[PDB]
Structures are given as C-alpha cells and as structure tokens.
Paper text:
HOs catalyze the oxidative cleavage of heme to biliverdin, carbon monoxide, and ferrous iron, in a reaction that proceeds via a complex multistep mechanism. The HO enzyme present in L. interrogans (LepHO) is required for iron utilization when hemoglobin is the sole iron source and is an important virulence factor in the hamster model of infection. We also showed that the redox partner of LepHO is a ferredoxin-NADP+ reductase (LepFNR), a plastidic-type enzyme found in this bacterium. Hence, the catalytic heme degradation supported by LepHO and its cognate electron transfer partner enables L. interrogans cells to utilize iron from host heme and provide a mechanism for circumventing the iron-limitation conditions imposed by the host defense system.
Herein we report the crystal structure of LepHO-heme at 1.73 Å resolution, which displays distinct features compared to the structures of other structurally characterized HOs. To this end, the LepHO-C26S-stop variant was generated by introducing two mutations; the codon for residue E206 was replaced with a stop signal, and the codon for the C26 was replaced by one coding for serine. From these data, it can be concluded that neither the replacement of C26 by serine nor the removal of the 20 residues from the C-terminal, significantly alter the capability of the enzyme to degrade heme. The folding of LepHO is similar to that of other known HOs; it consists of a single domain of approximately 50 x 40 x 35 Å composed mostly of α-helices. The heme is sandwiched between the proximal and distal helices, and the heme-iron is axially coordinated by the Nε2 nitrogen atom of H15, which resides in the proximal helix and by a water molecule in the distal site. Analysis of the electron density in our crystallographic structure allowed us to corroborate the heme seating predicted from the 1H NMR analysis, as well as the presence of both heme isomers in LepHO. In LepHO, G128 is within hydrogen bond distance (2.85 Å) of a water molecule in the distal site near the heme. A relatively rigid network of water molecules, which extends from the active site to the surface of the enzyme, is also present in the crystal structure of LepHO. H40 in LepHO hydrogen bonds a water molecule in the network, a function that is usually carried out by an aspartate in other HOs. Analysis of the LepHO structure revealed that residues F157 and I160 are part of a depression on the enzyme surface which likely constitutes the outermost section lining the network of hydrogen bonded waters, or said in other words, the probable entrance to the network from the aqueous environment.
Author numbering: 1 to 205
C-alpha cells in the first residue's frame, strides 16, 4: 500500500524511542543548555551537509526525481544558527563526533550503492523538520531565552509559504515514487536505521 502510510505506521515506535535521550526529554520540558544545544546543531550540520551533497548528486535518479525538494535543505540554516551561538563557527575546531561520523558514512555509502534509500533519509529528517519546526522553534526560543528571530533558522522554511500544503504535497510525492511494495519495505528498513542514527547523535549530548 501507500509508501507515506507504510513509513508513518512502520516508524511510530522509533519516533517515540528517539526521545529516550535526556537531551530531548529536557528540550521537551522547555530546558536547554547553550553549549549542549550548539553541539547538537554541529552534529546536524555534518548530517545535512552530507545528505544535501548526496541528494544533489542523485537528483536525476528515477526514483528520487519526484522528491527533489531543495526548499527543505538545512545546511545553510544550520550554519546561520551556529554563527549565532558561536560568534564564529570553525568546523576544524568542531570536527564531527563519533556518532555523527557513522551517520555521515551511512549517508555516503547508501548514496553510492542504493541511492533510492535516500528517500528514507529525506522522510525521517525533512518531513520531521517540516512537521515539528513551528513547535520546536518556540520551545527552543523559550528554553534559551533567544532574541526575536535569532538562532532558530533551522526550524524555518522561507521557501515554503504554505507548510500544510507542502507536507501534503510531500506525502503525495512519496506515494508517487516508482517503487514496488518490496522496495517500499527496504525504504521502511532504512527509515528505522535513520531513527537509530539520530538516537545515536542524541545519546552523545
Ligand atoms: C529524532 C527525533 C525526531 C525525528 C527523527 C522526527 C521525525 C518525524 C517525522 C518523520 C514525522 C512525520 C510523520 C509522518 O507524517 O509520517 C514527524 C512528525 C512529528 N513530529 Fe517528529 N521527529 C522527531 C522528534 C520530535 C520532537 C522532539 C518533536 C517535538 C515537538 C516532534 C514532533 C512531531 C510532531 C508534532 C509531528 C506531527 C506533525 C503533524 O502531524 O502535523 N518530533 N516527526
């Protein structure tokens, strides 16, 4: 049946388990520490930089073509938030953590061997970002007592003026992917792995 439905129903438990980290529990209670939050953005910087490198590389893949959504890219939003927190963010002074490196390796290796599985990476990260952004930006601003419009670029999509319409269009796009039900199962298996890789980076904080 529907790939968007398969992924939603198939990853409901993984979404819940990704909050077993104390970083996320406190974030959900409205508690964040500046230093820890900034390291959390560093891990996402490396992840999205790699994912966007690989999605651009595979943009004309027949399966990925209909989910070519540069509107969702986060690398530049992350850089901007990193500059707000650090003043000047030097990547060589803040090299990727062990869990970040394993996540980037997964992205790279998937891109070169099974690029259709990058659909799982797009789903887990971007559809989550679009779904949670408005809520998470308010929680983060309140937790860190942030100035108006600063340090929350990661949660904002200036290229998308209708978030609700885009989320619907995204799920319709997932359902349009030219993949069979067996291939959708492989996309679900990858999505579960992505949730685990996110739990891995959260575990470090
Ligand atoms: C690893 C952490 C997380 C990942 C990978 C993630 C991923 C996702 C994904 C992929 C969806 C889309 C589900 C679907 O429509 O099929 C989603 C939905 C959602 N997520 Fe998360 N999520 C995470 C954590 C959080 C956190 C911390 C919040 C706190 C607000 C949150 C709030 C939501 C909400 C409210 C939705 C549903 C939005 C809607 O239906 O309008 N998530 N998430």
């Amino acid at each position: 049946m529907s790939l968007a439905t398969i992924l939603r129903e198939g990853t409901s438990e993984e979404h819940k388990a990704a909050e077993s980290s104390a970083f996320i529990r406190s974030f959900m209670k409205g508690i964040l520490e500046k230093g820890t939050y900034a390291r959390h953005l560093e891990a996402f910087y490396y992840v999205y930089e790699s994912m966007e490198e690989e999605l651009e590389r595979n943009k004309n893949n027949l399966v990925l073509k209909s989910i070519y959504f540069p509107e969702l890219y986060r690398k530049n939003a992350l850089l901007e938030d990193l500059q707000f927190f650090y003043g000047t963010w030097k990547p060589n002074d803040h090299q990727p953590s062990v869990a970040t490196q394993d996540y980037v390796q997964r992205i790279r290796k998937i891109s070169e061997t099974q690029p259709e599985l990058l659909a799982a990476h797009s789903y887990v990260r971007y559809l989550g970002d679009l779904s949670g952004g408005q809520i998470l930006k308010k929680v983060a601003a309140r937790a860190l007592n942030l100035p108006e419009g600063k340090g929350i670029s990661f949660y904002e999509f200036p290229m998308i003026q209708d978030i609700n319409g885009f989320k619907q269009n995204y799920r319709t796009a997932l359902d349009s992917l030219p993949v069979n039900d067996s291939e959708k199962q492989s996309i679900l298996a990858e999505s579960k792995q992505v949730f685990l890789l996110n739990q891995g980076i959260f575990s470090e904080l």
